[PDB]
Structures are given as C-alpha cells and as structure tokens.
C-alpha cells in the first residue's frame, strides 16, 4: 500500500500542462492573460488555486461538464471559420478585458452589436463537411439595464437560438443587475454545441449573441484535468495524484482517490 508522495508532479512520461494563472475554461475562451495557451495540448492539464479571470465577467451554466469535455479532448486546437454577420458590428471589446494597451475581448468569441440604428434577425449556417466532431463555444450578453439593451442591440428583448438537427438551445437574455465584478454588473453566459459530420450549425438571433469565431477539434483519448498546487519537477513517474507523483510498484495506495496514469487501486 503506497502511502506517501514526493509532493511534486513528474513531467514524464505524460505531457503535463501547467495552467499557472489560467483555468482551462479561461484558456478555451481566450482571456488575454491566457493567450499563451492557444492551440495547446495535454495528457494532463493542471489547474492551480492562483488561477483568476481577467476579462468580461462571465458564467458557464453546467460549467463542470464543459470543463470535463474539453479536458478529455486534450486539445485547444482552434480553426477559424468564414462566418458572415450581415448588418451588425463585429469585434466588440471591453476595458474589463485589456489586450495590449487597448480594450479587448475573449479571443475565440465575437461580440456583435447594432450597425447604425438596426440589428437585423441574424440567420447563419455552418455545415460540418469534415469527418470529425466540431465543438462550438458561444454566448449571450446580459445587460444590466434596458437602456444598455436598446443601445447595443436595438430590440428591447434579444434571443439567441443555436441548433443542429439533433438539438436546439434557445437562450433568453436576462436584463438586470448581478453582483458587481470589477465595476460591472453585466455578464456573459457561455454555452456550447457539438456538430457531428454531415450536420449543420444554425444560429439565429435578434440581439445579444456573443458569436463563435470557429470550432475546437474534438478527440477522444486518455487526456484529463486535475486540481493541484504541487510543483512540476523533472523526473519520470507513471502515476500522478494531486498530492504529487507516487510510485506504482505496490498494488494499493491511500494517497488520493484522484489519480492520473497507471496507478495502484485506492484504499
């Protein structure tokens, strides 16, 4: 029964990616201080308790499922697609989400606003004509007042519908004040859609769409994610726990229920 660890995660034989100040979800969305994670890959993504968000305030309904899905895929490989957004203003940014000296936004999302005095009913389509599954990440903006709503989107109530042949999500923006985060009471909510080969992403909105820019490639394989503050070290160990790498030569272990790699069974 293996009962101790070194307190460090050995960087072989698995590709360990240290999140440093970034959650996987922030790396996914493209929070600017996470830009260095663009198109990264891992066998194990390590999330640290120092991680913090530094972009527009957001939530993710069913956060844990998206985090798991992405973690298991083992890649942030992103392919930009030729989405056409007729009659709207693209690339909205924020002083809450600085990239370089200037206001910015999540790299993988496209904040659409009115053009002139109009925001039309957007109706766009993106077929999956590839032989793999595509993951799309998108959102909805929740203004804090009616005046913000009509200033940005014209319509007094927006709506975002994203569908494939297999399913449909219709999100209704919720106008109102949330708790203050760094001087803002507005939020974005994040949602996702998987598009299988031969299916088609359909997006329909008359306001408040935070649009996708393209898709993330989905793989199935051995990859995962772990919450741990253990430092990474230069050594070899097959079995990793949040407490650190452990030898796997004994058949049982009581260091942690959470393990990555070929490990001893937990007790």
């Amino acid at each position, epitope marked *: 029964v293996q009962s101790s660890s070194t307190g460090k995660i050995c960087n072989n034989p698995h590709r360990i990616l240290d999140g440093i100040d970034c959650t996987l979800i922030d790396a996914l969305l493209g929070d600017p201080h996470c830009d260095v994670f663009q198109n990264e890959t891992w066998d194990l993504f390590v999330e640290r308790s120092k991680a913090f968000s530094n972009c*527009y305030p957001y939530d993710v309904p069913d956060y844990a499922s998206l985090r798991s899905l992405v973690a298991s895929s083992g890649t942030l490989e992103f392919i930009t697609e030729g989405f056409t957004w007729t009659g709207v*203003t*693209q*690339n*909205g*940014g*924020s*002083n*809450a989400c600085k990239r370089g000296p*200037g*206001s910015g936004f999540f790299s993988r999302l496209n*904040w659409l*606003t*009115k053009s*002139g*005095s109009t925001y039309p009913v957007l109706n766009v389509t993106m077929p999956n004509n590839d032989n793999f599954d595509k993951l799309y990440i998108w959102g909805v903006h929740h*203004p*804090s*007042t009616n*005046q*913000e709503q*009509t*200033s*940005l989107y014209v319509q007094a109530s927006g709506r975002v519908t994203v569908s494939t042949r297999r399913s449909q999500q219709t999100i209704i923006p919720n106008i109102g004040s949330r708790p203050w985060v760094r*001087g*803002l009471s*507005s939020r974005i909510s994040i949602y996702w859609t998987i598009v299988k080969p031969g299916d088609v992403l359909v997006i329909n909105s008359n306001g408040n769409l935070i649009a996708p820019r393209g898709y993330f490639k989905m793989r199935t394989g051995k990859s995962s994610i772990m919450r741990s503050d253990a430092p990474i070290d230069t050594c070899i160990s097959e079995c990793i726990t949040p407490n650190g790498s452990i030898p796997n030569d004994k058949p049982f272990q009581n260091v942690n229920k959470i393990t990555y790699g070929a490990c001893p069974k937990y007790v």
Partner: antibody
Amino acid sequence: VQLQESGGGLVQPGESLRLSCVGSGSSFGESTLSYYAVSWVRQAPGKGLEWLSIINAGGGDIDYADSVEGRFTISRDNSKETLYLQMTNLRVEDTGVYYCAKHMSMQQVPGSGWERADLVGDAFDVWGQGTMVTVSS
Amino acid sequence: DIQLTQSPSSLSASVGDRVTLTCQASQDIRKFLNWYQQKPGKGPKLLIYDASNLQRGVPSRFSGGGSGTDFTLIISSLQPEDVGTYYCQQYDGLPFTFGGGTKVVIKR
C-alpha cells in the same frame, strides 16, 4: 445631444489657449456625448472647413492634421461630458471659428463595459455654434 | 491627402427649380462621403451621410448619390431657405477633408 464651445478669444502669436466643448441633452439610447467620437474643425474667415483632430469616446485613437500636430492636444473628461483642445505656439493663420463636431456612430456605451473595436469617424451629425479664436499682435 | 473638388463654384436658381451640385474626389473613397449645409455665421448641418442617406429631419427634397470618385447632391425643388454654402466631406482617409463649397443663391 447639443454642443457648446467656449474659451475663444484674442491671443498673441506664440501664446497658448485652451478651448472647451460641453455636451448636453440626449440621442439614441438616451445617449450623451461620451458615447461618441468627436473632432475639432475650424473655419478661417471667409474660407472652408479644416479638420484638426479626432478623439474616440474612451479617449483613444487620437489623430491630428499636419497643420496642428505637435502644437495642439485633444482630450476629454467624460465625467463632465467635456472636450478640450489645448493649443500652443499659436500663429496668425490659426485664426478662425473653432467647432466641436460629434461623429455619428456609437463608439461606447458607458457603464456597459462595451467599446466598439474600430473608430468609425463618420458624419458630423451635431456641431456646436463655434468659438472665435483670433491670433494677432 | 484626398482632395475634393466641388462644382459649380456658385449657382442661382429659381424657387422650385431642380438643382445639381457635384463633388469629385482625387481617389476612390467608396461611399465615405457626407454633405453639409452652412448658413452664413452658423454651424454646418448634416444633410446626407454615406453618399445617399438622408439625415433624420432633413427635407426629402435633398438626395445624394454616387460612389468612388463622383458624387452628387440634388435639391429637387429649391426653396428660399436653401440659400447657403454646401460642402462635401470624406472620411475614407486621414486627414478628413472637405470640398471648397458651392454657394447657392435664389434667382428672384
């Protein structure tokens, strides 16, 4: 939205002068001057219009005409819905009526945390009445 | 810099006449072209934005057209209050520039 310039008057060649432009009222939303990019434009006596300088809603993407670059500085204080033009090293040929002119496209919604990515710099849909600047000995 | 040249330099026409003002740009400015009316000793007022859009509150006798290098402002039925100077203005590129103006006078 309405605009009113002030600060114009007589100055000697080589002196400085600071002009102000104050926004009051409302537009789409119930928008104030701080939603918008603004330029200064002048008109010499009997002559046409000369664009001088632009400033985006949030204070950035500043540019100047070559005639005034290095001498004039545009700035704004959105808490007072006020624009400024700080002029230095003034010359006789700077003499004219100075207008504040608001560009039409919404460039930010203050309090929302949204700013438009690009400075559009489109049509001047509101102009002030203008303030006269005379540079003479 | 982009130069705009207006024609004619001035004109007189009778109340009710159809009046055509032109603006030529020294290079292709697409439709990044606006028209203003200035009455003497007053600020300019926007008439037409982006070559052909009539500003809200402007009488429908004003219309604009063109793209690229050649633009027109048409007053379909000239009225006594239309006297003043009319300027075109481009924002395709910095510095933003104005034409030299066309002065409109009523022949009575």
